[PDB]
């Protein structure tokens, strides 16, 4: 049975809302993938989550109560104000925007325009489609927001359409990183 | 069930495994990797180098909490009457970082979710041949169900005659699983 | 310099 594998996990969480006006500090103790003990600032003390944590609850609350409660300030609030403010909360990566047509262009035939919006940060963004300067609401859909893993995201936004003479389709993108909205045009030849 | 907020900071996630005394120490902010501490070099490795110039973290804090991981993994193992971890089969998804353009430098991303336990091999194959360069990967990220996910990156040049596979080797898989991808 | 949540020892 040498192939038996064992592991523990310690997962701390500082939940911030409206700056640091509201903070919820949660600490999870895990064996293999079973959370057996947890500290939650809203609760105010350590609580056994499963039978496995029964032996710890009392000891943890008697020994680490004050120190753990204080981390809401000494770790959470401190890290937010002193380290996140100047980095994470300051990161602004402008999205790259390009348009592609799904099928070969056939005048007056159904098709799909795909607006690829990539490499942006933070995750909050808004993409709109326009046909001859008028916003399209029907036939618009999008893929799931993708977290690239390198502090950038991407998303594909599609527009079911029918290319007609002289039409100009515009992919419109609003994001905190842009002083003004990015607009890319696709013209029906 | 999930707790909601504007931002989430995980300052000091500890993962300690046995046998092999395997550990990982990371900082996460809103789901992204701030850094991981290389326990052998005793060095904090930042995902975004520009960040390390405005903030820092003494790797010793990683060593300390990792040591406590080793301690707790033993007290808990014994306390559980040696209940071992139950393997899961991971799932891979392959996609490009930016739109693929012939001859345009790009990056292939292999996202692997449902990883458990956090021990795995993620490599790439080009034309069925393993790639040994331009490959990099994140640390293990935590999931709500306490399983993990990880991403591997492969720099490449889009070409009509190139085939790619993200190979994933894990104990929960009989044979390595290949997630194919073609431009 | 950043602070870190302390993994507390049991027993």
């Amino acid at each position, epitope marked *: 049975d040498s192939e038996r594998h064992f592991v523990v996990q310690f997962q701390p969480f500082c939940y911030f809302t409206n700056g640091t006006q509201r903070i919820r500090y949660v600490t999870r103790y895990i064996y293999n993938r079973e959370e057996y003990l947890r500290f939650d600032s809203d609760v105010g003390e350590y609580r056994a989550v499963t039978e496995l944590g029964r032996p710890d609850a009392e000891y943890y609350n008697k020994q680490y109560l004050e120190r753990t409660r204080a981390e809401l300030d000494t770790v959470c609030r401190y890290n937010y104000e002193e380290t996140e403010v100047p980095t994470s909360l300051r990161r602004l990566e402008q999205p790259n925007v390009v348009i592609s047509l799904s099928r070969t262009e056939a005048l007056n035939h159904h098709n799909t325009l795909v607006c690829s919006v990539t490499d942006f940060y933070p995750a909050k963004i808004k993409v709109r489609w326009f046909r001859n300067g008028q916003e399209e609401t029907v036939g618009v859909s999008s893929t799931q927001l993708i977290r690239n893993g390198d502090w950038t995201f991407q998303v594909l936004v599609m527009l079911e359409m029918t290319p007609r003479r002289g039409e100009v389709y515009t992919c419109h993108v609003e994001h905190p990183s842009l002083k003004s909205p990015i607009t890319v045009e696709w013209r029906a030849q | 069930d999930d707790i909601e907020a504007d931002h989430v900071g995980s300052y000091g996630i500890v993962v300690y495994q046995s046998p092999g005394d395997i550990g990982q120490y990371t900082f996460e902010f809103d789901g992204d990797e701030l850094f991981y501490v290389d326990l052998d070099k005793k060095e904090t490795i930042w995902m975004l180098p520009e960040f390390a110039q405005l903030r820092s973290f003494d790797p010793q804090g990683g*060593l300390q909490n990792i040591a406590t991981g080793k301690h707790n993994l033993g007290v808990l193992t014994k306390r559980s009457n040696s209940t071992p971890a139950t393997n899961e089969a991971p799932q891979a998804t392959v996609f490009p970082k930016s739109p693929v353009l012939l001859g345009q430098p790009n990056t292939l991303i292999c996202f692997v979710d449902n990883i458990f336990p956090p021990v795995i091999n993620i490599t790439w194959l080009r034309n069925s041949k393993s790639v040994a360069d331009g490959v990099y990967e994140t640390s293990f990220f935590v999931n709500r169900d306490y399983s993990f996910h990880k991403l591997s990156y492969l720099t490449f040049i889009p070409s009509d005659d190139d085939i790619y596979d993200c190979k994933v080797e894990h104990w929960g898989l009989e044979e390595p699983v290949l997630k194919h991808w073609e431009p | 310099r950043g602070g870190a949540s302390q993994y507390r020892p049991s027993q």
Partner: T-cell receptor
Amino acid sequence: AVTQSPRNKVAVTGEKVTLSCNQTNNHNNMYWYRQDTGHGLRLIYYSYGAGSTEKGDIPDGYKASRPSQENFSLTLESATPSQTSVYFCASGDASGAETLYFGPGTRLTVL
Amino acid sequence: SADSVTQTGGQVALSEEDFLTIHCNYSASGYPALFWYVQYPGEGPQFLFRASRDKEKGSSRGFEATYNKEATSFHLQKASVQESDSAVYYCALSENYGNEKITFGAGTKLQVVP
């Protein structure tokens, strides 16, 4: 209780000196400090567990070993007069902002 | 500079039943926990109490100190000292880094005259 060995020791310049520390508190952390007038206590070396050795604030001229949980030694390869001091060993449970349990000290004088 | 603790000069002499105050100000780069230790003759320092955040008060055997982040102080207080209180008091701190490296001050010698 934390116990140090030896309690007293006179050495000559260039001598190889080793101070021993033992604790049965089952503490994961162990530390070596020196105490000197004007400086108070200064950390030389500490350990997070068996096999680990971390440099303190003033490691120069010193070396340490943590061969087991209970024991932690400090070694002065080549004793110099500046190393004359009172050395204190302490153990702790490695719980953030942990309290230290000190030994009664070892008075070392290098002549 | 590296974190440091600054406490009253060297030696102070009081009469029994006098009130005791030993100053301690700290210079730290993070958000440290603060402590006071007492070292009686022929012994090593022994823990008195700690305080993890601003406004928190630690206490033990009549001694107490309040975390004051505004003045970066952790001044020791004792209502009425006794001869047996004669010893060396140390101010110390640990950082929120998870480091567990405890930094001590220079110590203050207290002589409570019989």
